[PDB]
Design a protein around this ligand. Structure first.
Ligand code: APC
Ligand code: APC
Ligand code: APC
Ligand code: APC
Ligand code: APC
Ligand code: APC
Ligand code: PNS
Ligand code: PNS
Ligand code: PNS
Ligand code: PNS
Ligand code: PNS
Ligand code: PNS
Lengths: 157, 157, 154, 154, 157, 157
């Protein structure tokens, strides 16, 4: 029974994230999206709002489930009987940074990490940049799933 | 049901490669190692030699097989009913180059690519560098599987 | 009637920035320097002031403060090009995403120029940090800014 | 009377190149595409030909072959700007050295533009390699080049 | 006669750092480890603790001494009659950032910087990441010298 | 007695190289410039011509000597009782490539590598680009030492 965990804050989930979810779900028997809460940086959406937006956007992925998590990511992964993390990468800079975390995670817990390259169309999309653009009235509707931009309107007003 | 292809020239396979094979075999139901041959440029080892060296050092991986091929990698993958490539990466430079190839491969054939970070211990190991060092008498024993080391020194002499 | 906008915080403006201004003014009929009001050592007005003195010899350049989306600043003045300097591959990877976002949302393009070799290590932040602990940044900043920097720390 | 030169081997010209041509023509009064005669699949004349057909709708652009120093090509036509597309940070680091060399020896500046996201993975060499082994590169090349590519391999 | 300064916050020193100290001490007549303190932001360990942890794990290096400092690194270096900084680097990203600092340091004070590549085994080790992993219960024992591990777990509790 | 080897083809030596030589000679009791011959790529200048140009350019560095070398670099270094290599770096890309060679050299022979950042003024200078520019009539006189550009005129005519 194969599987992997896709970690992130997803505040909010973007089409870049969604593309990674779809690609992981096509290759693993199960995927768990882990919505990670930092009590320092309270973002725009609550953890429940983020989970709901991810579930709506992944409605057609039957082997994908979404949960919140806290603490050590590798503990979250092992607690669920898995030992793989899947993450999207956009740049070589991203790779150099994630490489250190991947090696640390494999060292401390034997959990592996599989990376996928961003889809070309979403290479410049990030939750943070989309929010910043939207805050000043930019149209990011083509960068976010449908279930998100509606809720994003509400938060900005 | 789930599966991946691990491609390369493997001339010869290194411990860096074997680490990637082992990690792929742990996460996918089957792995096929694709020894890709350019029919116009010969390398150091024959196809038979390349395949034998990989088989000898992967005997403990029951769900891994080894095959040679040529032409487009995505055709090799799809012909076998698979849809995933797994590749190791050492550097950000590697990632930027492989990103292009992975995006092209997804574009023309819908085949996805999963990258894994090199094991720290083997981060500087490459077939080409190991051959070059060995050519001038350097000690590469701890970098190559036993199935490879004496076959390499044999070629060199 | 070509034109480009050179955006930044410019706190203060360095010779590195000035070099980009000069090169942009040489290739576009009109250049506007956009001081984006956001950290901070100088007032937006002093920044603008400091840029204005360093740029006296450039007839087709002017300096304006800005708020909100950079692409709105650019389009509201009838332009659709941004010119920015780059020092490193890391800079490029970061800037590429903003460039692509800006083109996507507003059709504003971005042209990058390589740093002058002499100014490869110059940044507003590093120049401040070094001047803070008494280091000589004279050769890195416009004469204009150099005095106002010494007096801002004294 | 602004202007820029877009240099390359263009063998063949890709939609990635075309996108840069379009963006350069939008910001400079005059753009010259320089086909530098140096590997090779198409003749310099076909390359030039193939670029000319893809660029019909751009009135301020022309296509010329070139030999020797790029900066001499640029200056001999009265210009001192080069426009080139960049995909990656690795590209930038390589191109930065040539940009700085070109500025040093001839005072010719270089403006870089970020690849369009859709064409991030498109290169002349990769498109050829894939078309060689039967892959469909239709959506990546101009309709002009696409037929001449199919007939060049058949 | 020849000498170098190895600077850092060392909060705490890691095996990655100690590897750099050892390699510097092998190549220069003397090495001074400079524990640079920001008087406005405290870290996890006091200056006394930082110095003690480094001394305890460098006892076998007769030509290495440890001192704290603050303000400009180049003043610390020149005051001691030296003219060289030695720093470890892990990534190309690190190199691009440190290049700027090294060129500035040479510009303002004529002080040169020599970089050394990280040991492969410690390529993913950083004080900050080790603290973060330890904070959430991860096993960082093989990444830190013995002089550090129990002092860190003590702080955390 | 401290020391390091500065390897390269130096065909011809540039001011970028010279800057590295000067900086190594300021920090090590002795520096050996190793002019490495590849029988495949016969460059523009013979090995003796290159050594002569380097000696003339380093005339004021009394602790620097110049020799030709072949074979494994780490053997060259150890044969002369040293165990350090000094190399200049221009870019993060250069660092990622040299990092692998440095780790390999330390693995196979215990020889370390110290890198220095390029001087800002010479960041875009390389022997290959200077030759290419000069070949088509570009003025590279400000990029090369005096003892070189004269000989470079002769070779081009
Ligand atoms: N356009 C895109 N394509 C592919 N992957 C992407 C992507 N945008 C983001 N990702 C990936 O999705 C991960 C999770 O995204 P987010 O949750 O929004 C960032 P975060 O980890 O919560 O905060 P951070 O910025 O401090 O790292 C990122 O770390 C990145 O790996
Ligand atoms: N030390 C290492 N750790 C992890 N992966 C490695 C590795 N060394 C090589 N690899 C991977 O193994 C792949 C195949 O290596 P080789 O067969 O030796 C040369 P290649 O097949 O021509 O690779 P390339 O053309 O994709 O660059 C590399 O592309 C790289 O992805
Ligand atoms: N030495 C240099 N040469 C060429 N361009 C430079 C340069 N230094 C900076 N620039 C460019 O000019 C822009 C403006 O820089 P500044 O606004 O003064 C500081 P900043 O790095 O932008 O702050 P930030 O990182 O917090 O956003 C930079 O973002 C960069 O694009
Ligand atoms: N997808 C893309 N988007 C934007 N610009 C691109 C691009 N692909 C290529 N370019 C730019 O257009 C230039 C011309 O490329 P080409 O001449 O066709 C192949 P090349 O990479 O230059 O060959 P070479 O590497 O052997 O020198 C590239 O050097 C690059 O600067
Ligand atoms: N695993 C490793 N291998 C080699 N060198 C390392 C290393 N980890 C850290 N270093 C080096 O040791 C230096 C000091 O590390 P630390 O004191 O922990 C944070 P720092 O002092 O704030 O570094 P920085 O500000 O220069 O980025 C780093 O700058 C880096 O050069
Ligand atoms: N401008 C510069 N500043 C600092 N260091 C430089 C430099 N130009 C070159 N170097 C360094 O000097 C070394 C030797 O230079 P060269 O001998 O000319 C290259 P090479 O190793 O002979 O051939 P190669 O290009 O196949 O690597 C380079 O590997 C590089 O480390
Ligand atoms: C949330 C994240 C995955 C951030 O990485 P990301 O930016 O790729 O999403 C990382 O911070 C994390 O793993 N948090 C859980 C705590 C942890 O395991 N830290 C140690 C990572 S080596
Ligand atoms: C280009 C490459 C060397 C890379 O794959 P490999 O290093 O794993 O063998 C080659 O073997 C391959 O993957 N396929 C053969 C030609 C091809 O597939 N070209 C399209 C790459 S997008
Ligand atoms: C100010 C700046 C240009 C960054 O400039 P800087 O790198 O000089 O700090 C960028 O942060 C910006 O555009 N701010 C205005 C708000 C905006 O346009 N956000 C969307 C960026 S895609
Ligand atoms: C042709 C090109 C622009 C490279 O273009 P390309 O990346 O598209 O192949 C470059 O090789 C060139 O300028 N050739 C002409 C000779 C020259 O100018 N050499 C000095 C470069 S600094
Ligand atoms: C910026 C830095 C953190 C880097 O040095 P460090 O990481 O080795 O401690 C700092 O401690 C330092 O080197 N000096 C203190 C301020 C300074 O020197 N600024 C000038 C750097 S060019
Ligand atoms: C000549 C050089 C130093 C090239 O590196 P460089 O480009 O930095 O000069 C390298 O090829 C070399 O070391 N040649 C000697 C043979 C050798 O030792 N090869 C193994 C290097 S790990």
């Amino acid at each position: 029974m194969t599987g992997a965990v896709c970690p992130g804050s997803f505040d909010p989930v973007t089409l870049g994230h969604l593309d990674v979810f779809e690609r992981a779900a096509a290759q693993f028997d199960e995927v768990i999206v882990a919505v990670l809460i930092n009590p320092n940086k309270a973002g725009m959406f609550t953890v429940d709002e983020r989970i709901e937006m991810i579930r709506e956007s992944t409605a057609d992925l039957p082997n994908l489930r979404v949960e919140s998590g806290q603490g050590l990511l590798v503990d979250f992964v092992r607690e669920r009987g898995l030992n793989a993390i899947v993450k999207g990468l956009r740049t070589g800079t991203d790779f150099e940074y994630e490489l250190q975390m991947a090696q640390m995670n494999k060292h401390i817990a034997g959990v592996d990490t599989f990376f996928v390259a961003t889809a070309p169309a979403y290479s410049f999309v990030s939750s943070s940049l989309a929010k910043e653009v939207a805050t000043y009235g930019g149209d990011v509707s083509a960068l976010l799933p449908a279930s998100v931009h509606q809720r994003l309107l509400g938060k900005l007003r």
